[PDB]
Structure 1
Amino acid sequence: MDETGKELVLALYDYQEKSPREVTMKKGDILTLLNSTNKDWWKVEVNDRQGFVPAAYVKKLD
């Protein structure tokens, strides 16, 4: 149940948090998905900070 932990994202490019709804991710990091009901911004958790990341800098690993 809640098989969300099977699908993770790979930060292809680094991104600095510009607004509190976002989150800072370093390129090369594997992040856990919290929400994918968007094609533009995915909600992920980085270490202890949660926020949305631009799908242009991050890809899903099938």
Structure 2
Amino acid sequence: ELVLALYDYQEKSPREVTMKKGDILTLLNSTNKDWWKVEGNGRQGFVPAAYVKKL
């Protein structure tokens, strides 16, 4: 499934990745309510669930 980045997010921990507002990310794991695992820029890791929107 794909998600739209609603905001920029810069990774702050080893498991996180970075995205730019408007990016279209592949969603890998949305089981946690606060942090979703995505693929962004060839890297896989977590961003805040609230900062992306399922398409």
TM-score w.r.t. length of structure 1:
0.82
Q: Deviations over 1:12-41 (max 9, x none)?
A: 000000001110000000000111111111
Task: Tell me the SS of whatever aligns to 1:45.
Answer: strand
Specify which of 6, 12, 17 is matched with residue 11 of structure 2. Answer: 17
Q: Structure 1 stretches (4+) deviating beyond 6 angstroms?
A: none
Percent of aligned pairs sharing the same letter: 96
Task: Tell me the SS of whatever aligns to 2:50.
Answer: coil
Between structure 1 and structure 2, the one with the greater Rg is 1
1-structure distance, mates of 2:33, 2:53 = 11
Matched pairs, number: 55
**Structure 1 gap ranges (5+):** 1-6
When the two chains are superposed, the root-mean-square deviation of aligned CA atoms in Å is 0.8
TM-score w.r.t. length of structure 2:
0.91
1-structure distance, mates of 2:2, 2:32 = 15
